[PDB]
Design a protein around this ligand. Structure first.
Ligand SMILES: [Zn+2]
Ligand SMILES: [Zn+2]
Ligand SMILES: [Zn+2]
Length: 178
């Protein structure tokens, strides 16, 4: 197994996947690494299994259809993984914890949002459809863009949104288009 966390790339108290060589800090994995379970398989393995059990699940889909799906176990898992993939980028640090807004010439967003809050929302099963998760995720970046205006810091929002969007298309097998 790896000697660094797959998500944050740091050493520490790691839990090792029994079916691939990845390792995690307890709360870097999503969901948090489970108390018992020997063997244990990580979220990357669990996602791979879904794909292998139903190969047709990789045929192209329409986003509009994906968003209306109910958060049954498999969609719940996919959203957890997508969230994990965002945390895997180090630029996610800017969006992890609760922000605040005091900048000359700008007003804070009406509805602040941050990755840890989405993380709690997933854990507490507060989303009934994929749409709920995806709306909150996209809200994070949109609030950032709007607040930082012409400051070049706006680009961090663009960059992390691009990570989100690419992984969304991959994980939910969105039909490729130009
Ligand atoms: Zn970690
Ligand atoms: Zn694994
Ligand atoms: Zn089948």
């Amino acid at each position: 197994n790896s000697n660094i966390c797959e998500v944050c790339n740091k050493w520490g108290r790691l839990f090792c996947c029994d079916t691939c060589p990845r390792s995690f800090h307890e709360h870097c994995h999503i969901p948090s690494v489970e108390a018992n379970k020997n063997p244990w398989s990580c979220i990357f393995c669990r996602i791979k299994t879904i794909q292998e059990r139903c190969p047709e699940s990789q045929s192209g889909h329409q986003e509009s259809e994906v968003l209306m799906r109910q958060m049954l176990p498999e969609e719940q898992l996919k959203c957890e993984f997508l969230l994990l993939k965002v945390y895997c980028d180090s630029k996610s640090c800017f969006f992890a914890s609760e922000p605040y807004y005091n900048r000359e010439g700008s007003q804070g967003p009406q509805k602040p949002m941050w990755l840890n809050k989405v993380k709690t929302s997933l854990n507490e099963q507060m989303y009934t459809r994929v749409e709920g998760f995806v709306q909150d995720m996209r809200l994070i970046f949109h609030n950032h863009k709007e607040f930082y205006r012409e400051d070049k810091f706006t680009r961090l929002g663009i960059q992390v949104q691009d990570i989100f969007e690419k992984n969304f298309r991959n994980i939910f097998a969105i039909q490729e288009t130009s």
